[PDB]
Amino acid sequence: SQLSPTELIEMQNDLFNKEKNRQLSLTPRTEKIEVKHVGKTDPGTVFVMNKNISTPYSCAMHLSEWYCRKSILALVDGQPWDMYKPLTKSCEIKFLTFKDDDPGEVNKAYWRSCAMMMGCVIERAFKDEYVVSLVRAPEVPVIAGAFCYDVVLDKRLDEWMPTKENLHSFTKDARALIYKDLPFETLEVEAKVALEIFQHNKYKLDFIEEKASQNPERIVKLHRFGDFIDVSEGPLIPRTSICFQYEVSAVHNLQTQSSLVRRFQGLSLPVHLRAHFTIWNKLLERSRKMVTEDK
């Protein structure tokens, strides 16, 4: 199709906005939900929130700005929950930070957010005449030294590999993206609308299909910050500016029988957990190596 990348971005944003408007119009009235605070700090706290409008970020604002600054993830009584996803029913909320006793869920959320940011940088850092298709974000554990993202490039781009200058340019683009604060928004959609949202990336369509297959209700979780829309598992961090240290470590071209995919590995640390210069250098050196964990 004869579509400019900016036109594709505009169409995706318009369709996402239409879906959000439909979700908002699904609730005609403002229902009151009584949410308990099950956190260790202030037990028994009660919040009278608006149904499908109020957010755990708003609950943190009601509590104090310290909760907004520290807490990244919300546990709504059975599951992790991002700060900018509206609550549905009456429940209990527990806030989760980076320095908690079991921060693993927050670490996964930060890992996925960093992978999505790297994919957003990669998709728009390439020339328009070339074709770039994001495949997915392979969930590698925190033990692995770098978050990985899979990208399929044009056929004529299969010869060259990005150099140190290209990696530094990618890092500068990521830092520029971080400098502007872009909240992460999570929207619950169906495969029927996700297919028309993406409509161009075959790998993304396959990912949507395989993610909807395991869901009986055909529900696909979409995340959007700024003008970038992507599908990923679980919640994400509320703010981009939480990422303080950010580096694009390396790239590894893995060749299969059907196509060859560039796996970009990058390293990042949040503002709360920033490390020393030598420690960061050692972590980057470790992340330079190949990471292979898909199942």
């Binding site: 320095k99 500016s241 503002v271 957990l273 920033r274 490390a275 030598t278 420690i279 050692k282």
Partner: protein, 41 residues
């Protein structure tokens, strides 16, 4: 963004501090040993 001051020992764990100290000590020892023969490089 009122960021707080952070030192290298604030965010480390009990088991990691000796590991960091060793990873610095052996790296410095290797760097010093590398330059021990300047006339042949």
């Amino acid at each position: 963004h009122g960021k707080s001051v952070t030192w290298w020992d604030e965010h480390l764990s009990e088991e990691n501090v000796p590991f960091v100290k060793q990873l610095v000590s052996d790296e410095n020892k290797a760097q010093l040993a590398s330059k021990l023969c300047p006339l042949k490089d």
